[PDB]
Specification:
By secondary structure, this protein is an alpha+beta fold. The protein has one domain: Alpha-Beta Plaits (2-Layer Sandwich). It is about 25% helix and about 30% strand. It has two helices and four strands, in the order βαββαβ. The chain has helices spanning about 15-25, 55-65, and strands at about 5-10, 30-40, 45-50, 70. Strands 2-3-1-4 form a four-stranded antiparallel sheet. Strand 2 and strand 3 form a beta hairpin. It is globular. The termini are far apart. Bound molecules: copper (I) ion. Copper (I) ion binds near residues 14, 15 and 17.
């Protein structure tokens, strides 16, 4: 219970192809309520249910796509 959002700076992902790579690849794992990623600040925000899946798992998941994630939550 209780939602959550976290932003990770995803170094490597930096064109529309990479955007849709992350976004589409994310929108399938349980926990993910909403993804979106933006290249302007090379950020990915994953609105994951902060219970069943953790920042670790998101890190590994994004790493599997070939871009380096590190949690920040800027805004
Ligand atoms: Cu790209």
């Amino acid at each position: 219970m209780g939602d959550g959002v976290l932003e990770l700076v995803v170094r490597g992902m930096t064109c529309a192809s990479c955007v849709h790579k992350i976004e589409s690849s994310l929108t399938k794992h349980r926990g993910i309520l909403y993804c979106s990623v933006a290249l302007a600040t090379n950020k990915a925000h994953i609105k994951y249910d902060p219970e069943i899946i953790g920042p670790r798992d998101i890190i590994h998941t994004i790493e599997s796509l070939g871009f380096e994630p590190s949690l920040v939550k800027i805004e």
